[PDB]
Structures are given as structure tokens and as C-alpha cells.
Amino acid sequence: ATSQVLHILPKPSYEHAFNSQRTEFVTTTATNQVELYEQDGNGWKHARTFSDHDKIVTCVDWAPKSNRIVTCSQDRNAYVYEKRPDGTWKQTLVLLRLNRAATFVRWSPNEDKFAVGSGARVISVCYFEQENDWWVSKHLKRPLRSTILSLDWHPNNVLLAAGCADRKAYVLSAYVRDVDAKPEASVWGSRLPFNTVCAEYPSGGWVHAVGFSPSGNALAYAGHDSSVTIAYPSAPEQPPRALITVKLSQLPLRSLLWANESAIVAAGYNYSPILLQGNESGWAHTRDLDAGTSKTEGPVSFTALRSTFRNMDLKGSSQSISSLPTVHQNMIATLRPYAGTPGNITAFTSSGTDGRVVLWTL
């Protein structure tokens, strides 16, 4: 595995998405702006800001095939942005009907609908109507008891996992009629109307991250207790084949990604991605992707003269404050596919609270 630092952003970057051409990426600065960055040979350049939100943006996502960006904020709005032929982006307010902040958003795999987690105890599944040119929201709300910290969709368009602050990971049907085709009878169920519940899986701490296997036949999720759990369902109303919890020795994971049907990368407050490997018999932490796991005169510039005196004056002494050994210097907030066929991730990216955007190849 190798790390390449794509860009250093001036502000924390809780979320990002690269477009399907991997030529540009959107990211949420810790303000009401969203930055758009483009390639600049080997570098990256700031192309434009979106700024249609009233308060801090919380999450952002970019639909692969249909090329639309979707955004969430503490202002309780979402916007969908779509490219005009002249090269600029058409904003569009989505009426989420949320009583409290929007936390986290994902496009569904067919990109015909998107789901938004909230602090309001609910999830707003949004879809578009060509009859009205509206986006309209359906609220999943029956089992959810607290803030929703992350979402992931099943590779079939219906099922939605959600990690909730009430120490549980939910699997819900988000089937919306006259958008979806019928869901196939599958491990999670077949009687599958909107808001039917396929699992209410336990955790020791808040569930920060969730994600289905590339085959869809297992769920992995990650706790603020610094454990990763993999749940293997059996059938409706029935206990799982296995509910394997692996407890890490590190600070908590905040984001999670199946590399293939037998391996997972995870990352967060430990400042580094880790790799886990296993199957329905058992799982274990197996590698750290960062070589920083191992914790690895001439003329003097004017800026080294000025900074060695400003260090003596502002700080204790001349000596520089050290880097962390990891590539990221602060918690790594999100972890996203980048390359390889779906279900064999060959490379992934991450963006940090330090503002690093980084590409990792396995």
C-alpha cells in the first residue's frame, strides 16, 4: 500500500466526492461554503464555491453516472447541483421537511433517489418527480431513536443501513414506489415495504460508519468503542449466522469501506487507515496501510531566521513542533472508493479534519 497526498485544503474537510472522471472533486470546508477543485497538471486548483446554505455544511456527495452533487447542512436544507450546458452549476433546494440539522447524505446506486440522515430522529429519502419538477422526501422514522451519524445503500436500490447515536446499526427498506423496480427476494427479506426493518444490530458505542459487502450478503459497521462489527444475516425474524466483533487497540474508527468480499479498510481517530480481513468464520485486523504505523549543515533561509526567533518568543524555545508519523495530522473523517471494478477496490481516498485529501492504493 502507498499514500499520495493529492491536496492540502485551508480548512477541515469532513466530506468530499471525486467525479466519475476523477478529474475534479467537491469538498465541505467547515463553513457554509462547498469548494470545487479541478486538476492542474499534477496539482489541484480551486475552481468555484457553492454557498447556497445558511449554516455549516455537514456532508456532500457526487452521483457517478448522472453527474449531480448533493449537499447537507446544519441549516436543515439540502441542495442538488446539476451542470448547465454553459459550464456552471444549477442549484435546487430540496424540501427535506426536517425539524433539526441534516448530518449525512448519499446517492442511491441507481442515482434516482438520495437519503439524508438527521438530528431530528429521522432519515429523509428524497426522489424527483418529472410531473412537478419537485424533489420530495419520505421520512424513515419508526425505529430511529437518536442522531443519524452515517448511511450506506445496499448495491440493490432498496435497502439502507444507518448508524445511529443510540448505539445501534439499523437496516431499513427505502423502497419508494414509482421509482424503484421490485426488490429481489434476498438474505435481508422479500416482504419489503418502506420502513420495514431487517435488523437493529447492537454496538458498544455510537455507530459512526456502516457499509454492505459488495455481494450485499453481509453488513459491516464501526463503533466509537473502537470496534468493527461484521453482521451476517440469515432470513427475516431470524438471528444472524455470525455477528463477529473485532476490538481494535486504537482510537475509534469514523469511516469504513469493503475492499472486496473478504477485506475491509477502516479509518478515523487513529489518524490512519487499517485493513481487516476474514469471512463468516472470523475476522482480524491484519495491516495498517500507513508506514507511519512503524513511527518512521548549510545556509539558513530568512523564514527560518524569523521563525526561530518567533518560536523563542511565542513558544518555549527555538525547536520545531513535530509532525505525527502518520500522513494525516488529525482525525480522518471520510474514506471513499477511487479505482478498480465494483467489489474489488484497488485504490481509495480519504479526507481529514487537517484538510489533507489523500489517495491510497492497496
Binding site: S307, L314, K315, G316, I321
Partner: protein
């Protein structure tokens, strides 16, 4: 300031104005002082005539120890009937005033010096009686211990000069001993007061200051004051004793020594307050060095170049 003035500054400045003034204005001025004392200065009959008056709770005791003969000796013609509500009063006339600028200066000093001239009477009684015992002891050195023993119980002065204190003093043929039964009632001054009184005794035990009176301290009373009224051993008082030998009140020194021993407890009270003003300037120095231990947590970024008033600027 490192040590207190002996006189009341206000009366010194005020009389230094009116003794220079070509055209006096009227006044009515109550003026507080240490040890619960209070002056009243006013011009009751004419702008020309200043009445200075003094109020002091222990003055009835001080009249027993011969005060009126000392005040009539000092203020002479200027002494007046006590003002109603005041213990003593003096009437100075600005047209009948002394001639020279150095007579005016020493009269303005003398009238501002009233608190230490009224509270001096038991000290002059002790110094002048020690001068008699010093001659009697020089007539018979084997009788001298018995003269000291009887003067220690018969010639003892006690003045309840404020409600949390007593000054007790007596003559013996080679000394005047004076004991301050001293208490700080304000609890943060009681806590520092233990340090200030302890380090005061420990200071006298060093080669540099052996010339000073022998100070001693305890918290129970010296054996010769254990049955005086208001002296009680249990009530968290401290008993600072000074032994003034014949060399601490020789004729050139007597007046400074009386002035300087009365102010004792007031310098400790002042320096306890002025030590909080020190500890604060030493605390905000350590706070300003803990700033550096937090500053190494701010990431390095240049704040943009600005004019002196904080407005933005465009060069370099």
C-alpha cells in the same frame, strides 16, 4: 512607599495651604485615620480660625497616663474647649499665626502630628520613670532587682488602643518593655499575618540587625502581663514584645522611637495588603509564561499585514 508616615498627611497639606494663603476659604472636614481615630477640621466662627479636633476611643485611659500636661506643653496657647463629640480640640488663628516659613512648616507638622502626640503620653511616663529608676539602681545595685520587680507591677501602662489590640508597657532600670497583644480578624490577613509576624521575629536573630530592640513572640502572654484586663491567651492573639534598652531611647532618639513604635501594627497591616499587590504581579508573570505552553498548540499561519489601527494593507 516602604514605611508609613507618622503624621496625618491631610492636616499637614491643608495647614500648609492655609498658612501660605493670602485669602482663606471656609472648611468642614471629618477625616478618618488608623486605629479607629478620627479628626474634625472646621472654621466655625470665621474663615480666619481653624478648629482641629480629635476623637479616639481610648483617650479616657490616656488622660490617666498624664496626656493633658503633654498636650498643654506642646500646643500651649492654641488649646481650646473639647468640641462636642470629640475628646480634644485646638483653635489656630491664621492672622495671629507665627512669623517665619520654618515656624509655619513646623506648626503645620506639629498639628498634623496630633495622633502620635496624644498617644505618646504613656511612653513619656515610662521613659521619664526609667530615668528615675536608672538613678536609684545606680545608688544600690542590690536593691535594683526589687525596684524593677515592684515597677513591673505598679508602674505598668495598658492602653486598649483599638478593640483587637492592647499595648502594654512598663519601665525597669535599663529598659522600657512594650508588648503588643496583636490580632488580625480578617481571615486572609490572619493567614498572611502568621508569616509576617513569624519572619519579623526570625529577622532579629541575624547579625545585620542586632542593634535593634530585642523582639520576642508567643501565642501565651509574657509572665508580667498575664493578669491585665482584655489580655486572654486562647483567643488566637499573638504577643509581640519589644525590649527597648537605654540605647533605643537616648535623648536624640526618644521622639523617633515613640513615633516609630506606635506605628508597628499599622506597618504589618499595610504590608499584608501591599503583599497581595506583589503576589498578583508575580502570578500574572507565571500566567504569561503558561501562555507560551499553549501557543505551541496553535498551528503556524501568518495573520495578514495590517495598518496600526487594524485596517487591511496592500504592500509586500
Amino acid at each position: 512607599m516602604l514605611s508609613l508616615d507618622y503624621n496625618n498627611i491631610f492636616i499637614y497639606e491643608l495647614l500648609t495651604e492655609r498658612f501660605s494663603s493670602e485669602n482663606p476659604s471656609s472648611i468642614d472636614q471629618v477625616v478618618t485615620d488608623f486605629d479607629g481615630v478620627t479628626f474634625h477640621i472646621s472654621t466655625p466662627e470665621e474663615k480666619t480660625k481653624i478648629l482641629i479636633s480629635l476623637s479616639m476611643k481610648c483617650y479616657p485611659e490616656l488622660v490617666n497616663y498624664g496626656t493633658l500636661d503633654l498636650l498643654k506643653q506642646i500646643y500651649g496657647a492654641y488649646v481650646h474647649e473639647p468640641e462636642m463629640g470629640y475628646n480634644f480640640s485646638i483653635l489656630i488663628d491664621l492672622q495671629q499665626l507665627p512669623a517665619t516659613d520654618e515656624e509655619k512648616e513646623q506648626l503645620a507638622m506639629s498639628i498634623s502630628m496630633l495622633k502620635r502626640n496624644v498617644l505618646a503620653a504613656p511612653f513619656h511616663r515610662a521613659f521619664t520613670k526609667q530615668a528615675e529608676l536608672a538613678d536609684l539602681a545606680r545608688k544600690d545595685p542590690e536593691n535594683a532587682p526589687m525596684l524593677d520587680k515592684q515597677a513591673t507591677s505598679q508602674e505598668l501602662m495598658a492602653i486598649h488602643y483599638r478593640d483587637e489590640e492592647t499595648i502594654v508597657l512598663w519601665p525597669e532600670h535599663d529598659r522600657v518593655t512594650v508588648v503588643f497583644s496583636t490580632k488580625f480578624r480578617e481571615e486572609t490577613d490572619r493567614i498572611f499575618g502568621k508569616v509576617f509576624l513569624q519572619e519579623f521575629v526570625d529577622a532579629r536573630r541575624r547579625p545585620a540587625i542586632q542593634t535593634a530592640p530585642q523582639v520576642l513572640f508567643s501565642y501565651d502572654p509574657p509572665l508580667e502581663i498575664r493578669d491585665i484586663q482584655g489580655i486572654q491567651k486562647g483567643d488566637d492573639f499573638g504577643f509581640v514584645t519589644f525590649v527597648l534598652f537605654e540605647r533605643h531611647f537616648t535623648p536624640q532618639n526618644r521622639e523617633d522611637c515613640i513615633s516609630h513604635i506606635q506605628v508597628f501594627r499599622n506597618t504589618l497591616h499595610f504590608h499584608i495588603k501591599a503583599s497581595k499587590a506583589y503576589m498578583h504581579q508575580r502570578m500574572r508573570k507565571r500566567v504569561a509564561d503558561f501562555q507560551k505552553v499553549l501557543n505551541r498548540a496553535k498551528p503556524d499561519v501568518e495573520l495578514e499585514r495590517k495598518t496600526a489601527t487594524g485596517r487591511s494593507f496592500v504592500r509586500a
